[PDB]
Inverse folding.
């Protein structure tokens, strides 16, 4: 998968209280992958070591590849407004040279 | 006397419009300008054909040819000579009437010289000051530097003749010497290098063919129109050449033989063509290809 790139979107140090260890820490990583040609996916990997959470999330996301339709290879086909849970996103189709003017995660 | 045909004569504009041609893709080629998100409409085949018709109507207004005029005559009129004011001023005064509702060619622009002579402003002074007080988008107060022969040659190498002419129309007046100089230089470079296709489906094709007809050098345009299978256009060009030169040997020969269609082009080759041998060769080869294939 040399044509695919992986980017990190969040690294969290959550805690699970245990009788043996008290507060126990794991690394929860959210990553996204894409080949820059319409195919992309995301996954979450959890482990006790950060390096392991990177491997788990990176190889899991390659199994959930969406294909996204791009108008003329540079933009969305039409405006998109949606609510996912309590997060609202309002995307707009723009002409060439407009660039990405979006949340930093959306730019990634 | 039979009137000499004009550029705006309904007959000349018909022939010049035809040979120019139309191509909605070239006429409406995308402009490199600030962009907006495109709009979309769902249309039936009837609606789509209506929209294509409106596009062709706009392409006609877009292809309206710019005026072809004779060079203006220098303005040299002295309104007064008040010698009492000789030596009392060091610099000329230029007075411009800026009443809004006067045509620019009917405005009074006078100059009070240091000698005391009150004279009318020259053509160069008239155009410069009217740009300062009635600024026109595209025009600059001082003549741009792109119109220098070295700079113009640069534009020709890049095949930017339609821009050299679009710039010459924004800056200079149609009857000015600079306007005629730049246009006649662009038309001449197209001839030598056979780049007639650059100005097709543009408003500048009529003036170029007009210039060649008046200068009796339509040979290249005929050879080029024939090689592109536009032989109906070539015939119309020979008709325009037989219209602006009625007493020419070629025009008199076509009357004797009542030539029409491809015959008109053959008559031109024998009688008045600078390079008749090539016109027949290209015309003959076209007939062979048309006959052989179909």
């Amino acid at each position: 998968y040399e044509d695919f790139d992986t980017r990190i979107l969040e690294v969290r140090n959550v805690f699970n209280m245990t009788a043996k260890e008290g507060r126990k820490k794991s690394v929860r990583v959210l990553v996204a992958v894409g080949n820059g040609n319409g195919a992309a996916g995301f996954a979450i990997g959890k482990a006790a070591d950060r390096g392991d959470a990177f491997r788990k999330a990176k190889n899991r996301a390659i199994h959930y590849l969406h294909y996204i339709e791009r108008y003329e290879g540079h933009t969305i086909f039409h405006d998109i407004s949606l609510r996912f849970k309590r997060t609202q996103i309002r995307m707009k189709k723009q002409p060439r040279g407009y660039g990405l003017r979006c949340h930093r995660a959306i730019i990634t | 006397e039979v009137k000499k045909p004009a550029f705006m004569d309904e007959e000349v504009q018909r022939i010049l419009t035809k040979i120019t041609g139309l191509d909605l893709q070239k006429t409406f080629r995308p402009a490199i300008q600030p962009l907006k998100p495109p709009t979309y409409k769902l249309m039936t085949q009837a609606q789509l054909e209506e929209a294509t018709r409106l596009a062709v109507e706009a392409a006609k207004v877009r292809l309206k040819m710019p005026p072809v005029l004779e060079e203006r005559k220098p303005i040299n009129d002295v309104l007064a000579e008040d010698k009492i004011l000789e030596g009392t001023e060091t610099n000329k005064y230029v007075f411009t009437d800026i009443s809004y509702n006067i045509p620019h060619r009917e405005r009074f622009i006078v100059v009070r010289e240091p000698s005391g002579t009150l004279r009318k402003a020259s053509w160069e002074e008239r155009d410069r000051v009217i740009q300062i007080y009635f600024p026109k988008e595209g025009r600059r107060v001082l003549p741009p530097v792109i119109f220098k022969d070295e700079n113009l040659k640069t534009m020709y190498s890049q095949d930017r003749h339609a821009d050299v002419l679009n710039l010459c129309v924004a800056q200079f007046e149609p009857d000015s010497a600079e306007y005629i100089k730049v246009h006649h230089q662009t038309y001449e470079d197209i001839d030598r290098h056979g780049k007639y296709e650059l100005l097709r489906s543009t408003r500048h094709f009529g003036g170029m063919a007009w210039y060649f007809v008046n200068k009796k050098k339509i040979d290249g345009l005929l050879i080029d129109q024939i090689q592109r299978d536009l032989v109906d256009d070539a015939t119309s060009l020979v008709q325009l050449y037989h219209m602006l030169h009625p007493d020419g040997q070629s025009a008199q020969e076509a009357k004797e033989q009542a030539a029409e269609g491809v015959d008109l082009i053959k008559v031109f080759a024998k009688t008045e063509a600078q390079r008749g041998a090539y016109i027949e060769l290209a015309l003959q080869t076209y007939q062979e290809i048309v006959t052989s294939h179909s």
In short: The CA atoms of residues 8 and 31 of chain A lie 4 Å apart. The helical segments of chain A are 50-61, 104-107. Chain A touches chain B through seven residues (CB under 8 Å). The longest strand of chain A covers residues 5-18.
